[PDB]
Design a protein around this nucleic acid. Structure first.
Ligand SMILES: [Mg+2]
Ligand SMILES: [Mg+2]
Ligand SMILES: [Mg+2]
Ligand SMILES: [Mg+2]
Ligand SMILES: [Mg+2]
Ligand SMILES: [Mg+2]
Ligand SMILES: [Zn+2]
Lengths: 182, 82, 149, 88, 56, 96, 116
RNA sequence: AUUAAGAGGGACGGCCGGGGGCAUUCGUAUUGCGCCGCUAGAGGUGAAAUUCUUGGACCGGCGCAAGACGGACCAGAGCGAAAGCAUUUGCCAAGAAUGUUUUCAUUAAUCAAGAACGAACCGACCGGCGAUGCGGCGGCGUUAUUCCCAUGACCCGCCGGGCAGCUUCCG
């Protein structure tokens, strides 16, 4: 978007430095308003361009530079979730989006700590980065809030799932009873 | 606001206002004399015409009605009247 | 302040202060009258007759040149319309909507627009009865309206 | 279409544009016009062609939006159908 | 052949340019008896003087 | 066209004011370059009364035939030979 | 020259599939999943399981003369995630370790346009 | 009786709009079916368990059928009395505003009763500044160009009626 043009301009020298370590080129096209990433002949790792594609997409979603390049490490993955199509009404969409962040950002931060993933809400997309198991949980909970089920249920559900994990016994046994019921 | 005298508006002020909002209403349309090519007979045409104007002598199409001022044909010569 | 539209339009004609005919006008009062008669014999409404005179013959206002309005001139010669022009145009619109509405059962909007047109027809009909233009027995009927116009 | 002893002989079957290139052109502050036609060639081949275009911002333009009205879009669309039809 | 083609093209262009330069001076500028000539070079579109347009 | 053809592919090309003759693989082809609006320009006839009209002309009709009508029939009959291989023999015997 | 193939890598969170076909994609050369190599349901989508899956396919292509591959990375798509699974990286990496030449890579994850 | 209201009604002019009705058409996704290739599993979870599979499940390819839906472009933009309205083309009727030196001449406003339709701080508080959508007027320059179809795109000034902001003034 246009509002992201300004930020990218000063932080472009840094990302080209980061990509040059893996010999992948990038270009910030001001006229077209586009970011383009392409490999070279010096590159030896085929999968880094797929990781390079993810980095430019996160920056277009206003994700900060420090968190954005973090996914270049193999241990970290990423997932962008589009929530605009869920609700036709704009007023309902705004209200439920505000429920997700919660008071003072508490519910967002509580989800961030439990999931051990960095989550940012911007426009009609929510960007999450972290371990693969974590990204699965974020998509389950974030999509659920748009379906008119309160976030506090899933956050409290995640906490109870966490406490049972430390317990070595009854791991095989089902957790349906222990999970809270309406 | 800038001070304006309601009794004596300047000529550029009253030309700029809406025709109904002046001190005295005055339309912005006018009548003109047109001379068609082919025969040099003179025809009087209203500026904001709503119907196609044909020469009496040679029956040539002079103007075409539009949303606002009528558009004249190419090669014609027009004179504002009065 | 349109009756059925919330917006308030201001587009209208603004007559000049001068009521005198221009010097360039080479047509006389008698000459204009026969042009009115010929246009009426062609089958043109008085509103349309004034438009033709304005566009081609430079007749800005028939009332200022001949001293009489167009409709009053036509009545004197005997070319009097059966029904008032505004009333006749309104009845003509109602028939066209009703004819379309018979072939389109689900057109709710045409049903709603038909009510507004009939409301203006009833209001204007009562006013003309007061002015004795119409006899005090004329009624507007949907079946009769087609035969009326 | 035919095999001639370890030589598969092929013919044109269709054409398509890549996903990334298609996504890149579709911008946010412009209007896109699309049309489709069904045209038969001289040798009997019947084709369906899809065309897409985007409005262009002028160099000296100051208005941020470059939007085309509905009738202009249809006029643009009508020309697109005629050109593809006549050229096949 | 090239010289004659160049020479004919070299001769042709100033005549177009001279007409354009003359037309731009004559655009607007009502003459005596106050006649103003309708041209394609104004900002108001005008009806072309062609038979096809007249029939339309 | 003749200058570029002989430089990029080494073909014998002769330039004429109406056509270009090109020798390739023992065959001689005559290349004519046409302009789309040229028949329209030939139809411009300014009338004495003061109106510019469009009327068909023998020169205008001839150019439309050589550049537009003739290629269509040549392409149309070429496809017909594909369905009916015996069309070529009948037509040539008819001319003979 | 190089004999080319098309390699389909479906990478779900539950399981990882590596599948190699010809250029037209109609004739199947070799297909190994994560379940064939590890005898546990926890580790079927684990990166180690995918690495074994890639190694078995890569050596199979060698005896057939196949030297280079085109790659189609695909996620579960649809209403579900559009992120490649954990097995995607290791199986991709192991294919290059065996000496298989890498052509073009492309994501063929089915992306819906109208939400259900 | 006169005028022809910055009262109202009607006609006329070119445009404009996810406004309404009838037909028509295209697009992926998903699901099911048919055939070809391959062979032990596929799915789901926190871990599992219901289920599907050697009469071939899942995956890869080709084609067919069905039900929804109309992204991105999509804006605090537009339209409609409100509820509401988004692929293409053809047809039917309607409407707002603008333009008008056209016509009638007080025909008007608000309203219990009654009728049509109906998802699932405060007050008509004079103004100003920027944009934005439509119509019109005027203009130094660029950019295309008109067999039919078509006469525009951009910049600047100005006039109205709208969707909204930031501000002031009065009770
Ligand atoms: Mg009006
Ligand atoms: Mg009035
Ligand atoms: Mg109208
Ligand atoms: Mg229309
Ligand atoms: Mg419409
Ligand atoms: Mg405008
Ligand atoms: Zn004449």
């Amino acid at each position: 978007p246009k509002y992201r043009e300004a930020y990218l301009k000063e932080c472009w020298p840094l990302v080209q430095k980061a990509l040059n370590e893996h010999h992948v080129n990038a270009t910030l096209d001001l006229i077209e308003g586009s970011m383009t990433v392409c490999t070279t002949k010096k590159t030896f790792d085929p999968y880094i361009i797929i990781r390079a594609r993810d980095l430019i997409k996160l920056l277009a979603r206003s994700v900060s530079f420090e968190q954005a390049v973090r996914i270049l490490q193999d241990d970290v993955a990423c997932d962008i979730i589009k929530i605009g199509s869920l609700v036709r009404n704009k007023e309902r969409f705004v209200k439920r989006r505000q429920r997700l962040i919660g008071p003072k950002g508490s519910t967002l931060k509580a989800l961030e700590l439990l999931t051990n993933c960095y989550i940012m809400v911007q426009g009609n997309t929510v960007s999450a980065i972290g371990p693969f198991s974590g990204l699965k949980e974020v998509r389950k909970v974030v999509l659920d809030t748009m379906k008119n089920i309160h976030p506090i249920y899933n956050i409290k559900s995640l906490m109870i799932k966490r406490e049972l994990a430390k317990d070595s016994e009854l791991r095989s046994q089902s957790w349906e009873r222990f999970l809270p019921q309406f | 606001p800038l001070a304006k005298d309601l009794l004596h508006p300047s000529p550029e002020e009253e030309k700029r206002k809406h025709k109904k909002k002046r001190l005295v209403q005055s339309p912005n349309s006018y009548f003109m004399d047109v001379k068609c090519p082919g025969c040099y007979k003179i025809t009087t045409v209203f500026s904001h015409a709503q119907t196609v104007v044909l020469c009496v002598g040679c029956s040539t199409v002079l103007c075409q009605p539009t949303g606002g001022k009528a558009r004249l044909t190419e090669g014609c010569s027009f004179r504002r009247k009065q | 302040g349109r009756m059925h539209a919330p917006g308030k339009g201001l587009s209208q004609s603004a007559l000049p202060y001068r009521r005198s005919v221009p010097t360039w006008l080479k047509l006389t009062s008698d000459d204009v009258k026969e042009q009115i008669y010929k246009l009426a014999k062609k089958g043109l409404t008085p509103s349309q007759i004034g438009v033709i005179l304005r566009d081609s013959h430079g007749v800005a206002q028939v009332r200022f040149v001949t001293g009489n309005k167009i409709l009053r001139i036509l009545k004197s010669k005997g070319l009097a319309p059966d029904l008032p022009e505004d009333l006749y145009h309104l009845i003509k619109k109602a028939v066209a909507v009703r004819k379309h509405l018979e072939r389109n059962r689900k057109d709710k909007d045409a049903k709603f627009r038909l009510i507004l047109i009939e409301s203006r027809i009833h209001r204007l009909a009562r006013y003309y009865k007061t002015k004795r233009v119409l006899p005090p027995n004329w009624k507007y009927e949907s079946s009769t309206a087609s035969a009326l116009v | 279409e035919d095999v001639q002893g370890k030589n598969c002989l092929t013919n044109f079957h269709g054409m398509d544009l890549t996903r990334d290139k298609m996504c890149s052109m579709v911008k946010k502050w412009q209007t896109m016009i699309e049309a489709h036609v069904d045209v038969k060639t001289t040798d009997g081949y019947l084709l369906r062609l899809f065309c897409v275009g985007f409005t262009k911002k002028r160099n000296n333009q100051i208005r941020k939006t470059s939007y085309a009205q509905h009738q202009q879009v249809r006029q643009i669309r009508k020309k697109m159908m005629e050109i593809m039809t006549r050229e096949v | 052949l090239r010289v004659e083609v160049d020479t004919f093209m070299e001769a042709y262009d100033q005549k177009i340019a001279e007409e354009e330069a003359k037309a731009k001076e004559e655009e607007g500028v009502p003459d005596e008896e106050g006649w103003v000539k309708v041209t394609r070079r104004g900002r108001r579109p005008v009806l072309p003087r062609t038979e096809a347009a007249s029939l339309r | 066209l003749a200058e570029l053809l002989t430089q990029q592919h080494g073909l014998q090309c002769r330039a004429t004011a109406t056509h270009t003759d090109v020798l390739k693989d023992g065959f001689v082809f005559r290349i004519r370059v046409a302009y789309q609006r040229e028949p329209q320009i030939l139809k411009e006839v300014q009338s004495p009364e003061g109106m510019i009209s469009l009327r068909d002309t023998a020169a205008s009709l001839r150019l439309e035939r050589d550049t537009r009508q003739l290629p269509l029939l040549t392409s149309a009959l070429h496809g017909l030979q594909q369905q009916h291989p015996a069309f070529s023999g009948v037509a040539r015997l008819a001319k003979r | 020259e190089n004999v080319f193939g098309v390699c389909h890598i479906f990478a779900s969170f539950n399981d990882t599939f590596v599948h190699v076909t010809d250029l037209s994609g109609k004739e199947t050369i070799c297909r190994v999943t994560g379940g064939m190599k590890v005898k546990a349901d926890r580790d079927e989508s684990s990166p180690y399981a995918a690495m074994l899956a890639a190694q078995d396919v890569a050596q199979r292509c060698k005896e057939l003369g196949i030297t280079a591959l085109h790659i189609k990375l695909r996620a579960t798509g649809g209403n579900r995630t559009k992120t490649p699974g954990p097995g995607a990286q290791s199986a991709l990496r192991a294919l290059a370790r065996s000496g298989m030449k890498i052509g073009r890579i492309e994501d063929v994850t089915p992306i819906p346009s109208d939400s259900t």
